[PDB]
Structure formats: structure tokens, C-alpha cells
Ligand binder design. Structure first.
Ligand code: HEC
Ligand code: HEC
Lengths: 127, 127
């Protein structure tokens, strides 16, 4: 869907921004700093579900640019494992939210965050 | 969910970018330039459904900035009507996609586009 590589870069950066707001806005809830409303969190995690599937297709062939390391493309099966671990932890987070359990949510949120960081550390260029 | 107004600006700009890719990537299909696969379009319109609800909450109170006109806040019921017309045309687009009919899809796509432009012309700052 991208006319030039820069269009894929812009898309994935926007998707990751949006996805990252939906994740991070739950931090006060899982820390107990903000109240836990099970329906609110279930709806938010549904939005995060959708968003968390979107970035990866915008790292096609020859979309080098932005802060994406070239290793994303030359080590494709591996990058795919970092992405698939992350989305399987998103499935777990959905399960916790859908069930309405703050303990389970806390644990699942931590697992997702660890998977964000694992990919970050391997595949996002240094700042 | 925004620490500063600039965070709400960044969110809505990203949401609108992402939402706009999901809309515009269907243009070759509705023009007949690309093939029509009903299941592909149904899945894409589901993603657009989700995205099209996201920008508006990031125009809260005192999030002036970006290319948002101040009239968005001082004429709140009206802006809300531009937003609600747009999302009701997104409901129609979902219906067309879910039904699998290219004629209906074409018509519904045109209606959505007109609603994007109506809001653009009233509420996005001039370039
Ligand atoms: C788990 C919920 C997260 C969160 C919170 C973020 N990511 Fe990542 N990310 C990855 C790569 C390769 C990039 C660079 C993209 C590019 O510049 O081309 C990023 C970038 C980000 C950003 C910055 C976006 C921007 O506005 O420029 C942010 C806020 C962000 N990430 C947060 C790679 C990955 C992964 C590889 C499989 C995974 C998993 C994640 N990111 C997960 C998350
Ligand atoms: C219907 C599907 C669309 C499409 C394709 C776009 N919009 Fe809008 N838009 C609105 C406002 C106030 C802004 C400015 C936001 C800000 O800068 O603070 C925008 C901006 C955009 C962009 C640019 C995003 C960016 O990267 O900076 C794009 C690509 C875009 N729009 C496309 C307002 C509205 C509406 C008011 C109710 C509606 C409806 C739409 N936009 C609809 C669409």
C-alpha cells in the first residue's frame, strides 16, 4: 500500500506510536495508581489487539529507513520470532483483560513489556 | 492518557495517518484498477472501523496544537456532528464490505471520502 519506502516508514512509526499509547496508558492501572475498571481495560486491550498486528507488514521488501536495523530483513525468520512472541503475549493480555482479573493483567502486561524491549534491543537503531 | 498537549497532537496525527492509509489503499479496488477480493476488503474495513473511532478523544480540553483549528473546541457540538457523520458513513462502509458488493462499496467509499473532506475544509488549518 506504500508508493515509496518513506511511506512504509511513516506508517510503521505511526502504528508503533499508537500501539505504544494503548499499552503505556495502562501502566497506572497495573501499578494501582489509577482505579481498575474491567470493562474499560477490556475495551482498551481490544484496541491494542488490533494495533499490535499492524506494524509488521510495513517492514516489507526494501523498506529500509527510519530507525529500523537492516538485520530485520537479513535475519527474517528471527525478527519474525520476536514479532510472534510479542503477539502471542498480546493474546495472553487479551485473555487476562477479557477475564477481568487485575493480578493476571499485571503479569501479562509485564510479559508484553519484556517482549517490546527484546525486539527494541535487537532491531531498533541506537539513539 | 497524554502528559502534555503535544502528546495528544502526536497521537491524533498518527491515528489519522493510519486511518488514512487504510482508507486510501482501497482506491485502486473501488476504481477497478486492482482486483476485488471480498474477504480482503472486509478485513481491511474492520481495521479502518477501529482506527476511525480513535482520533476524536485526542482533541480534548486545551490540546490546541498541530494543524487543528481552534474552532474544533469553541464550536464543540458542530465539530461533533462532522465526526459523527463521518463515523456513520464508516458504519455504511462496513455494511457494504461485510455484504461483499463492489457497487455498494464504491458508493459507500465515496460517501466516506466526502465526509473526510467536509471536516478537513472546516477544521484543519490551511497549508
Ligand atoms: C510493545 C507494546 C512495544 C512498544 C511500546 C513499542 N514497540 Fe517498537 N519498534 C520496532 C522497530 C524496528 C522500530 C523502529 C521503526 C522505524 O523507525 O522504522 C520501533 C519503534 C518504536 C517506537 C517509535 C515509533 C516512532 O514514532 O518513530 C515506539 C514508541 C515503539 N517502538 C514502542 C520494533 C518492535 C518490535 C519487533 C518485533 C516489537 C515487538 C516492538 N517494537 C514492540 C513495541
Ligand atoms: C477520512 C477517512 C479522513 C482522512 C483520509 C483524513 N482525515 Fe483528517 N484531520 C482532521 C484534523 C482536525 C486534522 C489535523 C490534526 C492535527 O494536526 O492536530 C486532520 C489531519 C489529517 C491528516 C494529517 C495527519 C498528520 O500526519 O499530521 C490526514 C492524513 C488526514 N487528516 C486524513 C479532521 C478530520 C475530521 C473531523 C471530524 C474527519 C472526519 C477527518 N479528519 C477525516 C479524515
Amino acid at each position: 500500500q506504500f508508493a515509496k519506502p518513506e511511506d512504509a516508514v511513516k506508517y510503521r512509526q505511526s502504528a508503533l506510536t499508537l500501539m505504544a499509547s494503548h499499552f503505556g496508558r495502562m501502566t497506572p492501572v497495573v501499578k494501582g495508581q489509577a482505579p481498575y475498571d474491567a470493562a474499560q481495560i477490556k475495551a482498551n486491550v481490544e484496541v491494542l489487539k488490533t494495533l499490535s498486528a499492524l506494524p509488521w507488514a510495513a517492514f516489507g521488501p526494501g523498506t529500509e529507513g527510519g530507525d529500523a536495523r537492516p538485520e530485520i530483513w537479513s535475519d527474517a525468520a528471527s525478527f519474525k520470532q520476536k514479532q510472534q512472541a510479542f503477539q502471542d503475549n498480546i493474546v495472553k493480555l487479551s485473555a487476562a483483560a477479557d477475564a477481568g482479573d487485575l493480578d493476571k493483567l499485571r503479569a501479562a502486561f509485564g510479559d508484553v513489556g519484556a517482549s517490546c524491549k527484546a525486539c527494541h534491543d535487537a532491531y531498533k537503531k541506537k539513539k
